Design an enzyme around this catalytic site. Structure first.
Site, PDB file in Angstrom:
ATOM      1  CD  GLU A 114      -2.924  -1.088   2.376  1.00  0.00           C
ATOM      2  OE1 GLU A 114      -2.694  -0.335   3.339  1.00  0.00           O
ATOM      3  OE2 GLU A 114      -3.954  -1.782   2.279  1.00  0.00           O
ATOM      4  CG  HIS A 122       2.472   0.720   4.429  1.00  0.00           C
ATOM      5  ND1 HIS A 122       2.036   1.825   3.730  1.00  0.00           N
ATOM      6  CD2 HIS A 122       1.363   0.142   4.949  1.00  0.00           C
ATOM      7  CE1 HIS A 122       0.721   1.920   3.834  1.00  0.00           C
ATOM      8  NE2 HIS A 122       0.287   0.899   4.556  1.00  0.00           N
ATOM      9  CG  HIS A 124      -0.984  -3.788   5.684  1.00  0.00           C
ATOM     10  ND1 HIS A 124      -1.295  -3.429   6.976  1.00  0.00           N
ATOM     11  CD2 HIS A 124      -1.049  -2.652   4.949  1.00  0.00           C
ATOM     12  CE1 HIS A 124      -1.546  -2.131   7.020  1.00  0.00           C
ATOM     13  NE2 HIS A 124      -1.407  -1.634   5.802  1.00  0.00           N
ATOM     14  CE1 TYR A 205      -8.874  -0.604   6.699  1.00  0.00           C
ATOM     15  CE2 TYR A 205      -6.956  -2.026   6.643  1.00  0.00           C
ATOM     16  CZ  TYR A 205      -7.507  -0.770   6.725  1.00  0.00           C
ATOM     17  OH  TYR A 205      -6.686   0.328   6.840  1.00  0.00           O
TER      18      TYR A 205
END
Ligand SMILES: [Mn+2]
Length: 248
Positions: A114, A122, A124, A205
């Site tokens: 992202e 970065h 996740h 999400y």
């Protein structure tokens, strides 16, 4: 309702409530003796067989998930660096799995790159399975940060002296360029590892993010995702939103 969309939805739903760790792999800007080391200063393509294979996987994931109905103007250097980081992040995960003698097929994982409003690039990582327990979270973060700092210093394309490489290595560890999700707390107080629910976090999400199609990247957008089942990897943005809708 392609088989790919149905297949991803089913795979995630079966893992809806599987507890996993949440990590973020990142970097921060560094200046050492006048030398600028930015987010995309790690563009060596290291000729290690596994790393090469992982980078090819990222390239092909990008290629298959690209929507050609619309044009994509993401900078080539940005794509290259993200592909490299995907290989490095995975190399780190796999090295720690090896340390723990964990069979890769016994692990559920999800990776999503992202671009944040303030922090920029970065990645996740959700990871867990039968061989994982909450009390091991801090150890995992520390080990991942060791490997992440080691690989970054190896991949750095800026000409560095040995003292500078060691300083960069120390900065990446001391400043926790791998973070672990914990419950909110106080600076003095203890932090407790906060496990998340795998399928739920992905469907409700990560799959809700908007695809980066420009340079500079849209704030909060995603570049690329992948998982241990190769389920979400090739999905276009529209297909990802379909998965969320079906998952509910
Ligand atoms: Mn993010």
């Amino acid at each position: 309702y392609s088989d790919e969309v149905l297949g991803a939805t089913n795979w995630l739903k079966e893992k809806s409530n599987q507890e996993v760790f949440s990590f973020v792999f990142k970097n921060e800007n560094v200046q050492l003796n006048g030398k600028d080391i930015g987010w995309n200063s790690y563009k060596k393509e290291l000729q290690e067989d596994e790393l090469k294979s992982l980078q090819r996987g990222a390239e092909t994931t990008w290629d298959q998930s690209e929507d050609m109905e619309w044009e994509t103007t993401v900078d080539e250097m940005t794509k290259k660096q993200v592909f490299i980081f995907d290989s490095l992040v995975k190399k780190c995960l796999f090295e720690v799995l090896n340390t723990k003698n964990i069979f890769p097929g016994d692990v559920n994982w999800f990776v999503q790159h992202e671009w944040g409003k303030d922090q920029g690039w970065h990645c996740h990582v959700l990871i867990g399975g039968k061989d994982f327990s909450q009390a091991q979270g801090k150890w995992w973060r520390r080990q991942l940060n060791v490997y992440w700092s080691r690989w970054l210093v190896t991949a750095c394309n800026v000409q560095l002296t040995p003292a500078e490489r060691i300083k960069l290595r120390e900065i990446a560890e001391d400043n926790e360029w791998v973070t672990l999700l914990t419950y909110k707390h106080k600076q003095t107080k203890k932090d407790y590892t906060k496990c998340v629910l795998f399928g739920n976090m992905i469907a409700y999400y990560f799959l809700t993010k908007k695809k980066i199609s420009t340079s500079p990247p849209r704030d909060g957008g995603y570049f690329l995702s992948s998982d241990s089942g190769w389920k979400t990897n090739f999905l276009k943005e529209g297909e990802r939103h379909l998965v969320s809708k079906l998952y509910t």
